[PDB]
Amino acid sequence: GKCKDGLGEYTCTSLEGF
Amino acid sequence: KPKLLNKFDKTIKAELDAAEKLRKRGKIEEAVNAFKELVRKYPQSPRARYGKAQCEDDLAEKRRSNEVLRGAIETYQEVASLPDVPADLLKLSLKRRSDRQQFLGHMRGSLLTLQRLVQLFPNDTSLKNDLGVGYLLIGDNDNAKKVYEEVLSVTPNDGFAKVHYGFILKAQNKIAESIPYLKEGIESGDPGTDDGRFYFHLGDAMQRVGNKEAYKWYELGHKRGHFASVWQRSLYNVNGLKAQPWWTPKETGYTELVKSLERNWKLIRDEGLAVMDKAKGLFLPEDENLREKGDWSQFTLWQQGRRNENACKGAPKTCTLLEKFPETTGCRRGQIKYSIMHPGTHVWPHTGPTNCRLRMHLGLVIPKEGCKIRCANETKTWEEGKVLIFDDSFEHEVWQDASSFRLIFIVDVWHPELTPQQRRSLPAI
Ligand SMILES: O=C(O)CNC(=O)C(=O)O
Numbered sequence: 001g002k003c004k005d006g007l008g009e010y011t012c013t014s015l016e017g018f
Numbered sequence: 019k020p021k022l023l024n025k026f027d028k029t030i031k032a033e034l035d036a037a038e039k040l041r042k043r044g045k046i047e048e049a050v051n052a053f054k055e056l057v058r059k060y061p062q063s064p065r066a067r068y069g070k071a072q073c074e075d076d077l078a079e080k081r082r083s084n085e086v087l088r089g090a091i092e093t094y095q096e097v098a099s100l101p102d103v104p105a106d107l108l109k110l111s112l113k114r115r116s117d118r119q120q121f122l123g124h125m126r127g128s129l130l131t132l133q134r135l136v137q138l139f140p141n142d143t144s145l146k147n148d149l150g151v152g153y154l155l156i157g158d159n160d161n162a163k164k165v166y167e168e169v170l171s172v173t174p175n176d177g178f179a180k181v182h183y184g185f186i187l188k189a190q191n192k193i194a195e196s197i198p199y200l201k202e203g204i205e206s207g208d209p210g211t212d213d214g215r216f217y218f219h220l221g222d223a224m225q226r227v228g229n230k231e232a233y234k235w236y237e238l239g240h241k242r243g244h245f246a247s248v249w250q251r252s253l254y255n256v257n258g259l260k261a262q263p264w265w266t267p268k269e270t271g272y273t274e275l276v277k278s279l280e281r282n283w284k285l286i287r288d289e290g291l292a293v294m295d296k297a298k299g300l301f302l303p304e305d306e307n308l309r310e311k312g313d314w315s316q317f318t319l320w321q322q323g324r325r326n327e328n329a330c331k332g333a334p335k336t337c338t339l340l341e342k343f344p345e346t347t348g349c350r351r352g353q354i355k356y357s358i359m360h361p362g363t364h365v366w367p368h369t370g371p372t373n374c375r376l377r378m379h380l381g382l383v384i385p386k387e388g389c390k391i392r393c394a395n396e397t398k399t400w401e402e403g404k405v406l407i408f409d410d411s412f413e414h415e416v417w418q419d420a421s422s423f424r425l426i427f428i429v430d431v432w433h434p435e436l437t438p439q440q441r442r443s444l445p446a447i
Pocket residue numbers: 005357359365370377410414416426428
């Protein structure tokens with residue numbers, strides 16, 4: 001689930017680690 | 019306040035405090051060894067084990083190592099496994115375990131920890147809420163919704179549960195239902211309710227129902243530092259970037275890209291039309307609940323700075339043309355896509371997620387009338403073979419009332435004032 005045109009998702013980024 | 023020492027740990031409180039003292043003084047390095055010595059000497063001490071974990075946690079911060087943080091995450095688990103662990107310490111250790119698991123993106127692992135925490139402390143409302151966040155972070159809104167329903171059946175006044183329930187309801191296009199939950203939730207002032215997401219979606223829900231009180235909440239979100247302005251409400255921002263609804267090519271500095279799009283616009287059009295005719299399934303309906311009504315679909319060539327190889331086989335020349343412009347192909351907070359909209363379409367006022375991109379629109383097939391786009395207080399029209407540029411982090415709105423289809427080409431670029439290093443490091447959106 002990605003934020004392309006909007007801000008519909010709880011988080012729009014997905015980080016893994018440092 | 020928090021009691022962290024069981025009967026035996028109370029008998030070694032001097033050694034334990036000594037080691038913890040070294041950790042607070044930033045001398046994390048000899049603190050690790052101090053707590054590791056205590057763990058060898060007292061292998062069942064929960065407080066010693068927790069100290070080892072916290073030190074490993076700080077060492078992860080210093081060294082920036084995923085591997086050692088992974089170690090810390092195991093040590094936090096180890097604390098919970100030991101006998102006679104004080105309730106406060108058990109909760110603290112497993113809470114931190116989850117937090118750090120989420121940081122690494124082990125969201126599945128985090129969930130099991132949160133489920134365990136709720137199992138261990140069935141009356142702790144905050145932990146049920148945290149479990150709800152865990153479900154949200156993995157995209158499981160169904161299970162998230164259940165959790166907050168469960169919380170609200172016991173604790174109806176819990177603001178955290180209300181804003182999050184409201185957020186889920188709005189995501190489900192339960193606009194009217196979501197408003198009182200978002201509103202009462204923010205109004206509760208409970209910790210975790212003062213979040214830009216809830217201001218953003220409350221005002222939007224209100225806009226969709228014709229409640230003119232919407233901008234009062236945008237104004238408040240601005241006042242509380244969530245929005246750059248009442249018009250520009252993106253939540254993933256680099257502060258300071260030049261902010262204006264409409265941009266000229268020269269103002270962006272991407273004049274070579276604009277020249278190429280406008281000079282070569284017909285090949286871009288023609289490949290788009292070919293896909294419409296021979297492979298229309300490559301156009302995917304807009305799926306972010308932005309439409310009041312009508313038909314709107316997009317055919318994406320690049321997203322998050324990654325070329326879609328299969329999609330580019332449908333528009334090979336267009337993709338080859340774009341390869342020359344890393345300012346868009348490397349824009350990891352934007353896309354490159356065809357966008358088709360048909361008559362009887364109205365896109366709600368909405369806002370993009372980040373101020374770090376600018377959005378170019380190349381007209382490909384534009385009916386003489388019926389099509390227009392508003393950004394902020396200004397409405398404009400497309401032209402075939404001509405580029406429009408706007409900042410979609412500003413509120414914008416779209417209508418299609420022509421008598422045939424409207425096709426544009428959307429090319430996102432990094433905000434020009436972003437440095438090469440910022441362009442390199444910003445997480446993808
Ligand atoms: O593609 C369209 O017709 C409408 N586009 C947008 O709202 C956008 O580009 O952010």
